[PDB]
């Protein structure tokens, strides 16, 4: 099945209605890549991405990091340390607005 | 400890020319130092140079001709765009076409004049005049 990403679907199926592969959730907007740095809450992960910001006065760079909370479907079940792809969705909780759609490199 | 082989080589050359030395040895060699030396030779700032093989990273033997006012590395290695060379010229050079800035591009190492003719930017690594 395709959801417009162009990536392979997960190995097995799930019953989560909040899953974009086997449920009714839709993805639309930005797609980010990052690293998991926390997986304690049920079906929730924290994803961190690094980037450089340019300081015009000092003509030099500094490193900044972006942290995003995302929903973790049971068929994927990402864990701390691996690379993930996440896609934007409709509000799911107070802080959750993305869903994990693929593990790129297991830790 | 050693951090930057190219900076040592250029500071060594500028120290040696100020007291009239006719040749120098550049002790830790590398490919980038070789490309910089080729560009310097093309514009007439040095004479012949040769690679000498130890069991280590190699040595360069370079002939000097007393034609260098000054030469030095540029740290940090600032990126530059293809139509932005003038302000860097005013930063490092004494008149409008006096000397060369040495630039690392994805087409190789070259003077800023050749790169400006090709229409490309890159990273500044050295100046010689």
């Amino acid at each position: 099945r395709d959801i417009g990403l162009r990536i392979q679907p997960p190995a097995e199926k799930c019953d989560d209605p909040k899953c974009p592969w086997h449920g009714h959730l839709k993805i639309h907007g930005r797609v980010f890549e990052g690293i998991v740095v926390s997986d304690k809450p049920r079906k929730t992960v924290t994803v961190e991405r690094q980037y450089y910001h340019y300081l015009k006065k000092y003509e030099r760079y500094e490193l900044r990091r972006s942290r995003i909370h995302a929903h973790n479907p049971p068929c994927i079940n990402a864990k701390v340390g691996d690379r993930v792809l996440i896609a934007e969705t409709r509000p799911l909780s107070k802080t959750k607005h993305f869903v994990v759609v693929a593990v790129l490199e297991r830790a | 400890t050693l951090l930057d082989p190219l900076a040592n080589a250029l500071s060594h050359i500028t120290n040696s020319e100020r007291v009239g030395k006719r040749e120098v040895y550049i002790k830790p060699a590398s490919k980038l130092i070789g490309e910089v030396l080729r560009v310097m030779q093309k514009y007439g700032y040095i004479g012949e140079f040769e690679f000498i093989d130890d069991g280590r990273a190699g040595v360069y033997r370079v002939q000097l001709l007393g034609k260098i006012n000054k030469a030095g590395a540029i740290k940090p290695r600032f990126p530059v765009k293809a139509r932005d060379y003038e302000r860097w010229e005013k930063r490092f050079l004494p008149a409008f076409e006096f000397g060369i800035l040495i630039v690392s591009t994805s087409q190789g190492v070259m003077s800023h004049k050749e790169a400006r003719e090709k229409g490309i930017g890159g990273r500044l690594i050295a100046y010689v005049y």
Partner: protein, 242 residues
């Protein structure tokens, strides 16, 4: 707007495609909702007063409109707020003249004189297409209007095709497909008002819009958005364009 819809428009905030002197007065006409959108149309008062010059003041422009002297796409229009947009035909029968509304090379709206015969047809790009009750097809055009076709015809119309329509009778007479070798006229963007032929079509994932490469007459290739490319012919234009 603290509590309700806005009903006013300052001259300095008017759309950039109008030919209007932006500092001469405080207020401009706030156009009425209608066929086109705000970026691709202009109120009729500026056509009567500012463009053609048939009236000096708003009061005598309104008297001209109320007597029924101006036709838009073959129908009498009396509202001075009525929006007039891309590919419409403006007709004055008491003087016997006709114009087509088209964008400039700079993106501004202008009037292009045409023949009396060509004034009977309006090209309409197919913006959307849907099923409707009774299992029929509704076509939704670029100027906001709609048409119905039977289920047997469903393979002769798709989005981005152009339909030449006889106005004001609203009768179909020709379907022009969107494909390689078709003749197109650009309506928005940096390459606005350039025209030519279709070379290639490209698509992307996750809802980013699709792009087209176009060869002009002098042999140069340029790109634009697919939805900015308005089909006007097979291999020659079917309407008169500057």
């Amino acid at each position: 707007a603290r509590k309700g819809p806005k009903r006013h428009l300052k001259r300095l905030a008017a759309p950039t495609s109008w030919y209007i002197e932006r500092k001469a007065y405080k207020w401009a006409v706030r156009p009425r909702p209608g066929p086109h959108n705000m970026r691709t149309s202009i109120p009729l008062l500026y056509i009567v007063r500012d463009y053609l010059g048939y009236a000096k003041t708003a009061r005598e422009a309104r008297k001209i409109l109320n007597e029924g002297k101006f036709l838009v796409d073959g129908r009498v229009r009396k509202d001075y707020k009525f929006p007039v947009g891309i590919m419409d035909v403006v007709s004055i029968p008491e003087t016997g003249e006709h114009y087509r509304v088209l964008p400039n090379r700079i993106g501004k709206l202008i009037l292009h004189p045409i023949s009396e015969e060509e004034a009977n047809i309006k090209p309409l790009r197919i913006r959307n297409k849907r099923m409707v009750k009774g299992a029929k097809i509704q076509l939704n055009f670029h100027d906001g209007t709609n048409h119905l076709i039977p289920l047997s015809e469903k393979d002769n119309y798709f989005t981005s095709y152009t339909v030449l329509m006889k106005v004001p009778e609203r009768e179909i007479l020709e379907v022009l497909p969107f494909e390689k070798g078709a003749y197109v006229f650009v309506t928005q963007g940096k390459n606005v008002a350039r025209k030519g032929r279709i070379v290639e079509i490209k698509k992307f994932p996750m809802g980013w819009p699709d792009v087209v490469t176009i060869e002009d007459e002098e042999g140069e290739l340029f790109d634009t958005l697919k939805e900015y490319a308005f089909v006007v012919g097979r291999d020659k234009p079917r309407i008169s364009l500057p």
